[PDB]
A paper describes a structure:
FANCM is a key component of the FA core complex, which contains a DEAH helicase domain at the N-terminus and a putative nuclease domain and a tandem helix-hairpin-helix (HhH)2 motif domain at the C-terminus. FANCM can interact with the FANCM-associated histone-fold proteins 1 and 2 (MHF1-MHF2) complex via the region following the helicase domain (residues 661–800) and with FAAP24 via the C-terminal domains to form two stable complexes to bind different DNA substrates, which are crucial for FANCM to facilitate repair of ICLs. The FANCM-FAAP24 complex binds preferentially to single-stranded DNA (ssDNA). It plays a key role in the recruitment of the FA core complex to damaged DNA and the monoubiquitylation of FANCD2 (5,18).
Author numbering:
A (entry chain B): 18 to 146, 153 to 213
B (entry chain A): 1815 to 1902, 1916 to 1964, 1970 to 2030
């Protein structure tokens, strides 16, 4: 159901996923998991938060790939806590990826499950994935000095904000007159 | 690193005073408190940042309110970032919809660390030439603010960069995109707004 790295055979991660997601174990691949042919997961252990380069070059490789969209998941514990701000500066700010703190790899199980559910389910299934005339009247009402009654009368003679903008004081005199007519032309000019 | 501008919502003076204070006094950047009715920090043209506590995010009764706020922000901003800050489990679904929507998420341990995060977001956006620097003052602002889906900073650099609201109204989609500092499709939307005939 999703492609994993041989590194993960028989592990706690895989044990908790086994039931809800089927796993295909592949050898040598750069990520730890592939969600799709355009998205993947890079897992970072508490262990290799030791100022070592065990994960860094893997993340950079994924960034170089023209289509591949990487999302990094990390074990955040009392010991690795101090090293997290630098990981986050590198991944999210320098590299432009997603970083996900996780306590146990038992927590990462639930996370990867819901991460797959999100990916497999149809587009616009998540809420985050039309001209209004009332707004246009509100916008014209913001030009001094016209209120709720003068606004629609202006739009009647000049059907758009464009036409209202290049409207002569003469033509404005007819519909509103005197100071109000000059007050609209003064707003648009300079 | 310093001099860079940043917009802060008034509600943040009570909510995150140490953040604003650390931004100004430690990292020495030009912070401006503004009336941004629906958001916390404007860190560049195009990017808004939103801070929320780990308790708030775990309390999944403002789960749907939060999502609706992200939707409102999506209309006005090309890039959206949320900082989950530690305070002084079923919500993994919230995080995945955010990620899936291409919304960047940061994690902070304190208000001081959150300020460092905002500083660093500012520099990245400054390096990308989408930096915020502009006067942030002129009262044709309100007219630009009445246009739906227009961020406070968009409206701001519409007042600046356009000689007249008259010439703004007669500008081709190419130059409104560049002078208003907005997207290629966003320039078409406000064009259809100014040019809408009854």
């Amino acid at each position: 159901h999703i492609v994993a790295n041989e590194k993960w055979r028989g592990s706690q991660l895989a044990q908790e996923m086994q039931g809800k997601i089927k796993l295909i174990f592949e050898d040598g691949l750069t990520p730890d998991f592939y969600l799709s042919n355009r998205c993947c997961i890079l897992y970072v252990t508490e262990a290799d938060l030791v100022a070592g380069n065990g994960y860094r070059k893997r993340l950079v490789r994924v960034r170089n790939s023209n289509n591949l969209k990487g999302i990094v998941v990390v074990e955040k514990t009392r010991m690795s806590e101090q090293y997290f701000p630098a990981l986050q500066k590198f991944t999210v700010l320098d590299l432009g990826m997603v970083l996900l703190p996780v306590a146990s790899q038992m927590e990462a199980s639930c996370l990867v499950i819901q991460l797959v559910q999100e990916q497999t389910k149809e587009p616009s299934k998540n809420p985050l994935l039309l001209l209004s005339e009332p707004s246009l009247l509100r916008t014209v009402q913001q030009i001094p000095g016209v209120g709720k009654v003068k606004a629609p009368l202006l739009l009647q003679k000049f059907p758009s904000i464009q036409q209202l903008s290049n409207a002569s004081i003469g033509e404005l005199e007819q519909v509103v007159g005197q100071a109000v007519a000059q007050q609209i032309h003064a707003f648009f000019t300079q | 690193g310093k001099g860079t501008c940043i917009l802060v919502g008034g509600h943040e003076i009570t909510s995150g005073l140490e953040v604003i204070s650390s931004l100004r006094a430690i990292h020495g950047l030009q912070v401006e408190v503004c009336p941004l009715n629906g958001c916390d920090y404007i860190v560049s043209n195009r990017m808004v940042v939103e801070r929320r506590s780990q308790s708030e995010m775990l309390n999944s009764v403002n789960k749907n309110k939060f999502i609706e706020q992200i939707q409102h922000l999506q209309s006005m901003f090309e890039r959206i970032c949320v900082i989950v800050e530690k305070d002084r489990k079923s919500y993994d679904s919230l995080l995945t919809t955010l990620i899936g929507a291409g919304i960047r998420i940061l994690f902070s341990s304190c208000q001081e660390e959150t300020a460092d995060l905002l500083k660093e977001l500012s520099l990245v956006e400054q390096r990308k030439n989408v930096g915020i620097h502009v006067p942030t003052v002129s009262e044709a602002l309100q007219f630009y603010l009445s246009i739906p889906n227009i961020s406070y900073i968009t409206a701001l650099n519409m007042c600046h960069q356009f000689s007249s609201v008259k010439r703004m109204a007669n500008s081709s989609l190419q130059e409104i995109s560049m002078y208003a500092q907005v997207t290629h499709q966003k320039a078409e939307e406000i064009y259809r707004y100014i040019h809408y005939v009854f």
